[PDB]
Design a binder for this molecule. Structure first.
Ligand code: ZN
Ligand code: ZN
Length: 66
């Protein structure tokens, strides 16, 4: 940057299997949906993709929700 050629390497996320900037990947890792996340209800499933928690919390999870 700043009218210069530094070179920002990219790190292939193992979750979204996509290519990102090593500078972003650091933070993205959090945004990445695929990334597994522990259930807040500690039902048992253990870990489940961030984009999988929503549906799971629907019925999958032990708790009840309508
Ligand atoms: Zn990712
Ligand atoms: Zn659960």
């Amino acid at each position: 940057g700043s009218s210069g050629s530094s070179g920002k390497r990219t790190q292939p996320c193992t979750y979204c299997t996509k290519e990102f900037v090593f500078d972003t990947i650091q933070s993205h890792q959090y945004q990445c949906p695929r990334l597994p996340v522990a259930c807040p209800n500690q039902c048992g499933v253990g870990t489940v993709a961030r984009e999988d928690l929503p549906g799971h919390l629907k019925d999958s999870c032990n708790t009840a929700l309508v």
